[PDB]
Design a protein around this ligand. Structure first.
Ligand SMILES: N=C(N)NCCC[C@H](NC(=O)c1cccc(O)c1O)C(=O)N[C@@H](CO)C(=O)O
Ligand SMILES: N=C(N)NCCC[C@H](NC(=O)c1cccc(O)c1O)C(=O)N[C@@H](CO)C(=O)O
Ligand SMILES: N=C(N)NCCC[C@H](NC(=O)c1cccc(O)c1O)C(=O)N[C@@H](CO)C(=O)O
Ligand SMILES: N=C(N)NCCC[C@H](NC(=O)c1cccc(O)c1O)C(=O)N[C@@H](CO)C(=O)O
Ligand SMILES: N=C(N)NCCC[C@H](NC(=O)c1cccc(O)c1O)C(=O)N[C@@H](CO)C(=O)O
Ligand SMILES: N=C(N)NCCC[C@H](NC(=O)c1cccc(O)c1O)C(=O)N[C@@H](CO)C(=O)O
Ligand SMILES: N=C(N)NCCC[C@H](NC(=O)c1cccc(O)c1O)C(=O)N[C@@H](CO)C(=O)O
Ligand SMILES: N=C(N)NCCC[C@H](NC(=O)c1cccc(O)c1O)C(=O)N[C@@H](CO)C(=O)O
Ligand SMILES: [Fe+3]
Ligand SMILES: [Fe+3]
Lengths: 347, 346, 346, 346
């Protein structure tokens, strides 16, 4: 059969799939929602970003599935480090790639090599245009991986849990919305400050009824705004993203499966104590928050949209709990138990 | 002739120059009428303003040292008022409160004054602020011949309250936060004082909150036990106080001579008390301090706004009670606004 | 005692609480000193701020409705000021401008005030901004007892101007672009109003531009005919305006309530006028709009910067006048920055 | 205490209970202030509302039959008002219009009332709606002690007008459509009544139209000959009327008791008249009907919106003046909106 991927390309659905290639490792998150209690059964190989840039979620899956260590790494954390030779010798029967990210895009040579080898390629997207692409991506993955039921179940769950936010924020007029700046991998980049424009976590700010101060500063989904521009705009709400492991002395916010509330609050505070940042009205007024970075490329991003709405309008979403949503997500779909801290408030 | 807050008819004097204040802090209503000559027409007052509002007192003393020479007709309780000292001041009007630290409608002193031919006016900012605050000012305007100042203050008040009520009057009950207000928190012998259907409860109602003690109490004021608070575990905790900074007694420091630091530090002591410190609202940082004397003052629009910002922070992001306060002072009063009348927990 | 901008010695009042503004838009200098209480000390003002700055007025009214009750001593001309209404406000200081829509150093009203024992201070942001802006603020600081605010603003101003002059002071004349500024472009009976050696001309000088009218005119303001502009055919065209968005009269829309799109649309109308539209600067996109009231405001550092960025685009690509405005507002003012104070042609 | 629309100072009465309406249709401004008790304070009125607004009258009569007992001080002209009947109603305030079917600022009756000690207030929705509508409501608020209702209505009005001006203020003159408005079209002896720089002309201006009579006429109202209209051949034709459905006199049927099909049929008659029917605007279907009494009513924001949607159909496709009217009625009035106040040609 045939379907349209997120690059507009038609893909012939394989009769049976047993050798999935992951162009970006963290595309595993979309796969995990379909594979039930057998998450790694059909993965022939993956980019090393999941294992190296998601060490916490990795370790949790390793403790329950030690065979994860033996899935081949086709590269490190950049598209340019992928050996096309190692890829082809795994004889994949499907390759899942992202329109953007740490893996090959629609115009890469590897995509063309795979087309010459007779291997179907599917483009998904949770990163450039999450709002447009997240649900269509899951529907498509459902069809090509023969997990239509799991996919449709997850779409219903997602739509319902997002509708809990949008029923309220879709009617709020622009002049009542809080200004928001999201600093991606805050503290951890060479040059401050990474953020999202019209795309990526910007889509989440939009949905949650916020006003992204970088929406109109930037052409793309990702970009950079200077510290002074942030200070000058002086937004209502400051959000920092990170995924740093607890026992990592490098700069950044600690969030993820092995992070405690106190490690998340302490490390957010370091981030908020930085020169310039610490004079923001949002920081002084305590409207300062942390969000787990990898939500920037995951269909679990409904958790971030909900955390954002609850920060943007605390009393209108007093009754909404993203922790229940994660637990409903894990119990319904996944094969591990939820642990750690995926979001934090400054004390 | 006018009808006071006790339903009684009062013949308005032709000229008033000797006002008796049954409760000292009724001065607050008078101050909105007297412009730059606040104490010119006060023959005497209950000692509650001087002794239970030491900060606001000291500020007025520095600009008007003659305030120290206004006679104190008693201390802080109705029973300590000498009716003899009262009558020798030959008042031409007496202003009393339906409730509080001064005589009520059925006291002997009220009857003595009626026998002496002295008009008595009952106001209320304390039992039923919502029903009574504006009618009280209207009445004080008429009997003190300051109708203009009164009407000016009513317009100011209604406008600044309507900023809140036009939003919160349409909010359904199930979207409202539960609220407990602990009056003079930390400072009473037995915890915990609060307000029912009345007093600061009216402010919670107006600001679109849900007062957990509304149905626990028959009156405007009363007491709920600590364990009942813990068990109800309300969304939002509010502590009232008016303690002076350099007062080692227990309570929250708020008022004209209090810095935000002192207010924040002393609120924290209050929030660190056994039991209180495990409240969800305290842990989640939805914990606040409000200046106690707003429990009996037509300046109470400042508290209604502070509550609304606490109950729905974003919907009232743009509302600033410091600006309401500054406008109030500049338009009506004879002193400069200083100190901290509200605080948020660190 | 201090020396004002007219060279006159002025005795500093011990306390000031009743400031008279000879020109309403002199408020801008006062606003930098009064913090969160902008209108607290203004007894009255010329009607130019309320009538010729409707946008900035409306923004302050929404936060301080008491601004509507400040008395207007006249309309928009010195000759419409009733000296009687002025004197009954019993000012304790009067602030006047060497030039503009209010009384000057030789007016009768200035003499009346001297007879009444009222100190008069002359400032200037309009005739000789470069010489006078900072000295004016220093002086206002001393006579209004806001030396701290004044010195803070001077440091901010000098630093933000030095960002421009460090570069443009070393540029030789032959590398400078020729510039014509058309004040209230489109909106005068006879084209074309502009500035000579003074007013916005000072800004062109500082920003390293070459004002084509510098030597055509004797004074700070004057008129140059359309044909003279066409013939000089300058490298850069700048139009000033302050027209409200919803005003169908001719002129450029700029100010607190103007969007970038309205500013551009209305600048374009101005650039589409016969004669103007054949200028090389217009055809080549070197066409800009600046908010007119910068012609008399110590916020004029915002214009010196917008000019420097138009005169030398890459040399000041890192300079942002919007950040400077926001630092100005947050540090000194009581309102939030909105609208469009400068625009580039599409 | 307040300045009316004639520039005259009027002393705000302490309590008003006997309002005299110089022009009956000034009721529309009063109705926005009186909530559910519209006629409670009206001692008498000009007969224009009852006789020239039969539809809106009948609707109020069905809910309030006591409206029939309000005294008529005259018919539909200032000259038919008995000053004697007026004075025996012992009004405590009289509201008059700068222009219209009632007395003006120089009438004898105004002087009689001044001799009788009765405050007179001039409002205006007719000569200079743009300048005067909102100031008129502000003033009526103060003198009738309905400041809250007035301020509420001003905010509503400004917001609903801003929906139009946000768009039309940035449209350049050369892109605007030419417009002719024929007042009480078909119903006058001599064609064609219209508005100049004033009256419905102000609405055309605001809605981003170009009134072809703006410079043909000195006043707010006047007459332009059919041939002049034909020759100018404007982009858009608008006819006003308020004729009752069951009235076979010439004119457009619009108002509270008119269906869309009766408004369309009667507009068509108006558009089928010799000369009119050769207009480009008529042939192209840019032909419309507007309810005449908007020519003197603070509900005129409904016509400004209806005009903008006719001037720029797609730019205002999302704007609905019917939703605006309904928000107006529900927020402010005591009756239910019915009928057709505007119509498009089939
Ligand atoms: N290690 C490298 N040299 N490049 C990494 C490639 C992915 C790159 N990532 C980001 O730009 C980024 C920014 C903020 C926060 C993040 O977590 C990021 O991963 C990227 O997105 N590249 C884009 C544009 O080149 C793409 O592939 O389309
Ligand atoms: N494309 C680039 N040159 N820089 C942007 C991203 C590269 C790199 N990203 C990460 O290390 C990373 C970690 C966790 C999750 C992610 O998605 C990541 O991308 C990065 O941020 N590099 C810094 C240097 O430390 C920088 O380039 O400023
Ligand atoms: N020092 C005293 N013994 N009594 C004070 C007199 C008034 C008494 N006050 C309170 O109950 C009270 C409660 C909470 C917070 C406060 O500031 C209070 O003053 C009181 O209210 N009495 C009632 C009952 O008699 C009344 O006056 O009607
Ligand atoms: N009804 C009572 N017996 N006590 C409650 C009120 C009396 C007393 N009040 C104050 O000290 C006070 C201080 C500032 C402002 C006020 O309105 C006040 O009422 C009080 O609280 N007594 C405590 C023991 O100190 C108590 O009786 O529990
Ligand atoms: N409406 C009037 N008749 N006069 C206005 C008085 C101020 C007069 N202004 C200007 O000439 C002017 C020119 C260009 C742009 C502007 O904004 C202007 O205000 C003025 O400056 N007069 C001079 C000399 O008369 C002065 O007083 O110094
Ligand atoms: N000195 C004069 N006689 N005329 C020039 C200025 C007077 C008047 N000014 C303004 O309208 C004005 C508006 C906004 C800001 C200002 O500073 C202003 O001065 C003016 O220019 N009138 C025009 C008539 O359109 C004219 O002089 O031709
Ligand atoms: N019924 C009359 N004979 N006269 C009415 C007096 C008001 C007169 N009105 C109009 O001319 C008019 C024109 C077009 C449409 C209308 O609804 C009108 O009411 C009028 O305005 N007269 C002038 C001069 O006296 C004025 O009132 O200012
Ligand atoms: N000034 C005049 N003489 N005539 C113009 C207005 C007088 C009269 N008005 C009305 O009939 C009328 C009806 C509803 C609402 C209004 O405001 C009105 O004025 C009128 O129009 N007379 C006609 C004769 O048909 C005329 O003078 O042409
Ligand atoms: Fe008390
Ligand atoms: Fe000027």
């Amino acid at each position: 059969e045939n379907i349209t991927d997120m690059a507009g390309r038609s893909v012939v659905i394989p009769a049976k799939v047993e050798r999935i290639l992951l162009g970006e490792g963290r595309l595993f998150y979309a796969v995990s929602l379909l594979e039930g209690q057998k998450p790694f059964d059909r993965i022939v190989g993956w980019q090393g970003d999941f294992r190296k840039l998601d060490t916490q979620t990795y370790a949790v899956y390793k403790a329950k599935f030690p065979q994860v260590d033996n899935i081949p790494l086709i590269g490190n954390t950049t598209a340019d480090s992928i050996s096309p030779e190692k890829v082809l010798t795994l004889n994949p029967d499907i390759a899942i790639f992202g329109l953007s990210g740490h893996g090959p895009g629609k115009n890469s040579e590897l995509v063309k090599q795979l087309e010459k080898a007779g291997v179907p390629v599917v483009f998904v997207d949770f990163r450039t245009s999450p709002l447009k692409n997240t649900l269509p991506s899951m529907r498509v993955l459902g069809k090509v991986l023969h997990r239509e039921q799991q996919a449709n179940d997850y779409i219903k769950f997602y739509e319902d849990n997002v509708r809990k936010v949008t029923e309220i924020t879709s009617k709020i007029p622009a002049d009542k919305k809080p200004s928001v700046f999201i600093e991606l991998r805050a503290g951890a980049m060479e040059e401050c400050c990474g953020t999202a424009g019209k795309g990526n976590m910007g889509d989440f700010i939009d949905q949650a009824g916020g006003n992204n101060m970088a929406k109109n500063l930037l052409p793309g989904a990702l970009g950079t705004v200077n510290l002074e521009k942030v200070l000058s705009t002086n937004p209502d709400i400051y959000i920092a993203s990170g995924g740093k492991a607890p026992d990592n002395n490098a700069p950044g916010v600690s969030l993820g499966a092995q992070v405690t509330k106190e490690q998340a609050q302490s490390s957010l505070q370091t981030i908020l104590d930085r020169k310039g940042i610490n004079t923001l009205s949002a920081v002084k007024n305590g409207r300062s928050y942390g969000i787990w970075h990898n939500f920037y490329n995951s269909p679990y991003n409904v958790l971030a949209i909900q955390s954002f709405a609850k920060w943007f309008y605390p009393q209108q979403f007093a009754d909404l709990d993203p922790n229940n949503t994660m637990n409903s997500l894990y119990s319904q779909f996944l094969a591990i138990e939820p642990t750690g801290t995926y979001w934090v408030d400054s004390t």
